[PDB]
Design a protein around this nucleic acid. Sequence first.
RNA 1: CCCGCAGAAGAAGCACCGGCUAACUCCGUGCCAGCAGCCGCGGUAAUACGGAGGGUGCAAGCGUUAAUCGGAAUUACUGGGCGUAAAGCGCACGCAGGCGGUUUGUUAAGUCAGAUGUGAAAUCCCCGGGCUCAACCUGGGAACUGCAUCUGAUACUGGCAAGCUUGAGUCUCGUAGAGGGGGGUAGAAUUCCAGGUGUAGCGGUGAAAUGCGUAGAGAUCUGGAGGAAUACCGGUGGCGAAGGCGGCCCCCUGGACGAAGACUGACGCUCAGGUGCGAAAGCGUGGGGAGCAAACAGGAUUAGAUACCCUGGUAGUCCACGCCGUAAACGAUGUCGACUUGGAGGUUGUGCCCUUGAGGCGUGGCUUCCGGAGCUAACGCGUUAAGUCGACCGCCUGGGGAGUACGGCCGCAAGGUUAAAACUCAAAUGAAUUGACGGGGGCCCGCACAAGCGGUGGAGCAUGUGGUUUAAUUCGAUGCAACGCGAAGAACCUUACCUGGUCUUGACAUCCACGGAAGUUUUCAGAGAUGAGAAUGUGCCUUCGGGAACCGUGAGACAGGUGCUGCAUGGCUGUCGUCAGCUCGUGUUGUGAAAUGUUGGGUUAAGUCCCGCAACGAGCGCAACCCUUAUCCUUUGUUGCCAGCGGUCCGGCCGGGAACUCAAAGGAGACUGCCAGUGAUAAACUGGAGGAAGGUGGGGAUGACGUCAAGUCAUCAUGGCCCUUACGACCAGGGCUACACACGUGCUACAAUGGCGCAUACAAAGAGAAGCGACCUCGCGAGAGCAAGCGGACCUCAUAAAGUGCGUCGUAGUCCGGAUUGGAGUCUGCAACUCGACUCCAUGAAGUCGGAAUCGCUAGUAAUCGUGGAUCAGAAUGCCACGGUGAAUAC
Lengths: 112, 206
Amino acid sequence: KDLETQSQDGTFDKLTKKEALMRTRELEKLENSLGGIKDMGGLPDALFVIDADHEHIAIKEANNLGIPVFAIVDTNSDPDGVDFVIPGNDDAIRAVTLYLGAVAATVREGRS
Amino acid sequence: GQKVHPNGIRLGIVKPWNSTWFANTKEFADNLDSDFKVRQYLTKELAKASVSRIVIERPAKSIRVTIHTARPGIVIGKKGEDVEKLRKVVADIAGVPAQINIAEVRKPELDAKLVADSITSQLERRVMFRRAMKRAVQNAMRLGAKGIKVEVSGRLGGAEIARTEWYREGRVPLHTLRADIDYNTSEAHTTYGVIGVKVWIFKGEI
RNA sequence: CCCGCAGAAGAAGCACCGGCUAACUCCGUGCCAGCAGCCGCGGUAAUACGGAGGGUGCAAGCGUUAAUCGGAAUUACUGGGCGUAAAGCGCACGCAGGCGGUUUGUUAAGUCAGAUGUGAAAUCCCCGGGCUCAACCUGGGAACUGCAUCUGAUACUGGCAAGCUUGAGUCUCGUAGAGGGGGGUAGAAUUCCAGGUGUAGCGGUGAAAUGCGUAGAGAUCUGGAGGAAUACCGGUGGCGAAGGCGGCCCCCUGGACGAAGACUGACGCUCAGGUGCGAAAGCGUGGGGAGCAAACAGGAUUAGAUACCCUGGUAGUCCACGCCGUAAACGAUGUCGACUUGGAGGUUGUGCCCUUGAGGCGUGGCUUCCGGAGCUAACGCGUUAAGUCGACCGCCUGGGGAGUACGGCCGCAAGGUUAAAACUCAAAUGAAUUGACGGGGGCCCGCACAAGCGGUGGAGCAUGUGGUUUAAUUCGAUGCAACGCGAAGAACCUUACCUGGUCUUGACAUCCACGGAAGUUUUCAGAGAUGAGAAUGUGCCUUCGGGAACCGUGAGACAGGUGCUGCAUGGCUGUCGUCAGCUCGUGUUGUGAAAUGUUGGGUUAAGUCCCGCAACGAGCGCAACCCUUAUCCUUUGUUGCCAGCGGUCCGGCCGGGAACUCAAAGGAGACUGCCAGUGAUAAACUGGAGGAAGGUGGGGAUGACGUCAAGUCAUCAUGGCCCUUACGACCAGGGCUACACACGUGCUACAAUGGCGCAUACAAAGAGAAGCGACCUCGCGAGAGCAAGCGGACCUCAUAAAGUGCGUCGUAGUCCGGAUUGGAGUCUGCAACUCGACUCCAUGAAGUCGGAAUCGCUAGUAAUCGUGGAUCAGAAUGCCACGGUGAAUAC
């Protein structure tokens, strides 16, 4: 949250450009992976996922603090740990944006 | 057994000297023991005021002294009269008139020596070292000090083969010249042998 | 049993107190004494030994030893095991024995319910009761887990009778197969032997020799004789109970698998003992004998080499018939059977669709690797289990002793088989983790090697160490990481040692008393320490009968020690190593020791950087921030400077100037910032550009966690212990410098890109007041006399040397080399003998480029030249700094 703000109006250039550059990458580096959680805070209430294997680290973790998961397991994966096992395909794209599109609907109602 | 005196190579970069005066080849040595003579004086007489460093400056051949200690009162007693007894004795073995100025150490548990001091007494009176050691470390840690590293040599605990403990917190960048790292020893010569204390404190930033 | 009398009065110990296991300190002793059930204590600071205090427990007892059970689920019926820990027979047929599919009837053995008798009493248990309670006695009940009989119940099990088909087995038909025995047989090679040819080697080894060959080998061709083995096919292929089984052909013969049916109708599963089989080596009788080859022979290798290597070579292996019966006879996994998610091959039958085209879809046998649940100590097993059960057998019960002895059985024999005990040790094992190591592997680095340059070791000399001698040749360091080291400097001093002379509350400190200033000056005996004297001063505050100073005597607490212990310490140091690593938190995996992170693809000087990845972060490190060197700018211009101009005794000597050198503070500048290529669009490497400098520009400081119980108790501090009319103190002379020896570290050499003389050029940095010391003067010179000047960009040290030019020298032990000695002198300093430095003259050795072995160095470095400094009165070729000249080589 530091870097993300500093780079565009805040603290980004009180140093040498290439050196001040290094923090920029860290900002993107932080943006690249951790970016999607910034807002989250605390801990989840649900952990929808697209696959079970490719993210096998989720199930063994998410089902460890109990956060309810929602997994589209291919006919290749292992549903064991997943809460609401949804048969389907991971390896597609028109299918997955349907799933997202499927979840996209009622998530838009929940807000209340 | 090879690290340079961390206060050493910082003289001029950060740390100002403990003596500030001038001389020439004739008297330079002559000055050294005398000012060492007063250092020998106060160090013996002022355990109980918790002295950290004494600053010597020779102005126009009329010595000036500063006492870096915890209790500006307890060195002077009441009305400050007591230090007058301390003022003139100083000059005598020095040779020139002396006004003896004094500086109160604000974060008592932050100067190395005083911290290293406290350890000695607690360790000097048969009290468990770790119960104080890590208590000592944790102390200035939350009083605000980026890093602390104490180290005790000796035959700790009334042992029979010597070894060394230590401890570390925060940062103690002993290669960064830019840093401020207070440092002092204050050995402990208890009933059983002599045991040492080294403390590194990254008190400052530049 | 009851009552009265007397008084606190007649009555408290034993073990242990390190963990086990309740309860600890002190002293004594020093691997002694001793303790002890176990594990273990005892090396001068023992909670464990002996005493002491105190504590803990139990109590008229307490402990010790002995004995049984427990703990021990280490004999496991309850309630153990067997892939590797102890342990599945090597394998098979199979009698006794155990166990047995499914249906109905029956019987009533087992089983089961009720009853009956007997199950002696006391004892054990339950409610009581009786001795004041208790123990003890005792009433009544329960129980005495049982046995026999009567009466039944009939599920399950058994007997018996009758079935049934899944289990099991027979037949019909094919299919594959190194299954087994016998009897032929073919090609290739091996050696042999006879001919032809033809000629000096052949064979062999790390390199050789043994051996074979001019009575002609080896080579090549032709041919014959033999013996044993079957290339290629050949394959984590096949076949067999297991051992094991391989060219082709034929005869004899076992097992397996599949089809659609047929048929008996539980005929089963296993099995101590028993019978049979059963690699290799070996035994016996008799055949064979090419190759291989125990044993042995010879040659080598080695320190030795009854081996590893080489040339040969007997038995043996090969065949027949007997024998032996053991093997890591090992998927280290008993046999039979049921069941329990998948994936991919292989091999061999068979059904169907399209063989419509190497196919596609089923259904069976056997087999190979990886894997899930689950299981196991983990490692791994995983539908062919080590999973889930059931039947039967074998086998285990610490290690060694010992698979042995004894006896039995077997054997021609070697031996096999069945198989103890005493005694002895508290361990022996298994799997797995972290490191370390490897004459294991891969990758990467450093003057580590290689390529060069120059030294070492040979010589003399200076210096340090071992050895040796000594009155003493102090003490310490003494693999790299001691050895020109502590020592940045021993004639005296230093000095710690030696002989002799002496002192002892003292040479140095605090504290007490008196006489008395402190100090000043001076003689004799004496090596000196001291002893014995002779004069002068009488001084600061007045409590003033004294101060406070300072000298002496006197008294005692003490003082003093460079005395032993760096293995009781602190502090400081070397070092692996400027090596790039070392760790932690949080989370995850694992029962756990731990792991991951920190690995990997690349990349770098670097766990530096990017990416990926059960990791995300962090600390200490690397780098950076500090010094200095390289280019440039702003201020200032002296004691330093001299450009353009005046004067010039042309020399910054004088005005004078403020540009340049330079001096010094403060800024700039190098960041892979720009360009191209290569590269995973990444980091990054490569080359160019500008630039003084280009890839951490050069050099330095800064040395991680730890290792070495590495140094040092003598710099210092220091617990201990230690000595104290001395291991402490003061003095003189001596040693620390000794010299049959040996080593390390340097200096100068052996010469001609060099020595010598004359002329002559260019440096840096530094040092200076009981100091550095011009000018001038005398001496061959070392230096002496006088002596401005400078605590210092101004004075002095101070004259750089190699260089350069000119003449000279002629390969010599020479004008090389300069030691050793001779006399003769100078300075320092009380003092130059032991033992200084330098100068004059004479003297002129060894030595001619140095064995094995060996060290340093990657550019202004090596090499070579000279200068200053510290240490110090005096004393460098040692150490530390400075500038000059100026390379070779890295594939």
